[PDB]
Amino acid sequence: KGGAKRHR
Amino acid sequence: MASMSVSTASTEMSVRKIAAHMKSNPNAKVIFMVGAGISTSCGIPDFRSPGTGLYHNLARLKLPYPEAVFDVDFFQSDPLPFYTLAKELYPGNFRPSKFHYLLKLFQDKDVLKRVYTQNIDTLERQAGVKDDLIIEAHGSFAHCHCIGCGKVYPPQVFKSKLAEHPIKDFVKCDVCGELVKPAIVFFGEDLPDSFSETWLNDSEWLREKITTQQPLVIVVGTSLAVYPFASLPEEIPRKVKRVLCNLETVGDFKANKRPTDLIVHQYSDEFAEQLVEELGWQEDFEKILTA
Numbered sequence A: 001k002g003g004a005k006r007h008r
Numbered sequence B: 001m002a003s004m005s006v007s008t009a010s011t012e013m014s015v016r017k018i019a020a021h022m023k024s025n026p027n028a029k030v031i032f033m034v035g036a037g038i039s040t041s042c043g044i045p046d047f048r049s050p051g052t053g054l055y056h057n058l059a060r061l062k063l064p065y066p067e068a069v070f071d072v073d074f075f076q077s078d079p080l081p082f083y084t085l086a087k088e089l090y091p092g093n094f095r096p097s098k099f100h101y102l103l104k105l106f107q108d109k110d111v112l113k114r115v116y117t118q119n120i121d122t123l124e125r126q127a128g129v130k131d132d133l134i135i136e137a138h139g140s141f142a143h144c145h146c147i148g149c150g151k152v153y154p155p156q157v158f159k160s161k162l163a164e165h166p167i168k169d170f171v172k173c174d175v176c177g178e179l180v181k182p183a184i185v186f187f188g189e190d191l192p193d194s195f196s197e198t199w200l201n202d203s204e205w206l207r208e209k210i211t212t213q214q215p216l217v218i219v220v221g222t223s224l225a226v227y228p229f230a231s232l233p234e235e236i237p238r239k240v241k242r243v244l245c246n247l248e249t250v251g252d253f254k255a256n257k258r259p260t261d262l263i264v265h266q267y268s269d270e271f272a273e274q275l276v277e278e279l280g281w282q283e284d285f286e287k288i289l290t291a
């Protein structure tokens, strides 16, 4: 689903 | 509400191409992907910017760095910074921009397929955009939930605490006792299921249009530095025209430019003004603004 909210 | 161009250069010609694409494809719809840039004209204070009352209040409260206000671990250790930010940014404290109303206009003209937003101000919804056409990728204050057991809470309980002086005795779950917080996606948390599910459907929608009219995806006011939202642009079909209205070329538009990519360095409100003019909907637009 894209993973957790982050800057990476 | 008044706007002006970012530089001496005119963007009217580039904007005109967009209007031309729509004129040629009268039965096509547009998908918008937007960020904080479209709400700057609304006066929403940037928590990351010094010189903003919010930034300094958070600093005074010992917040280690801006984004710690959207960190679950920090929140659990000290919820005051987040409550303080909530008090200042709570929906209803601001009014939609000219660009937000442009979305409403497109909806009225039935040319709006969807608007994916990273903003938590919910100004798209406040402006009248229908729930079915909005994807609030980073959540909103419309719902509250216990970070421990997930019990649902009406948003009013949390909101009522924001009007107290000082803000204390934060909302705790009456089942497991953990902190209750607005359904805002914090860094480190997954986005709501509706995000990926809807993009899955709109992705198929985009591709099947390439083989019929020709859709259009417009990215506006985002630095495309926050994932997974930032992954959307690159996932747009190669054959679907991408438009970027941002003060700077960013993300995939910078890393992997496409021949048909149309970059428009312009303020979102000025962009909206110029697009309505080229589309010939000044009359209807003026009506919405005066509504």
Ligand SMILES: NC(=O)c1ccc[n+]([C@@H]2CC(COP(=O)(O)OP(=O)(O)OC[C@H]3O[C@@H](n4cnc5c(N)ncnc54)[C@H](O)[C@@H]3O)[C@@H](O)[C@H]2O)c1
Pocket: B034, B035, B036, B037, B038, B039, B040, B041, B044, B045, B046, B047, B118, B119, B120, B121, B220, B221, B222, B223, B224, B225, B226, B245, B246, B247, B248, B250, B266, B267, B268, B269
């Ligand atoms: N209204 C809000 O919900 C809000 C407000 C402030 C910060 N944020 C943070 C922003 C954020 C997502 O990054 P994002 O959307 O990319 O923010 P961003 O602040 O990183 O970037 C906004 C981008 O838009 C550009 N920009 C600023 N004003 C305008 C304008 N008038 N017209 C056109 N372009 C403009 C600018 O070049 C910048 O790249 C999250 O991590 C939030 O926590 C959200």
Ligand SMILES: [Cl-]
Pocket: B236, B237, B238
């Ligand atoms: Cl492809």
Ligand SMILES: [Zn+2]
Pocket: B146, B147, B148, B149, B150, B151, B173, B174, B175, B176, B177, B178
């Ligand atoms: Zn609970």
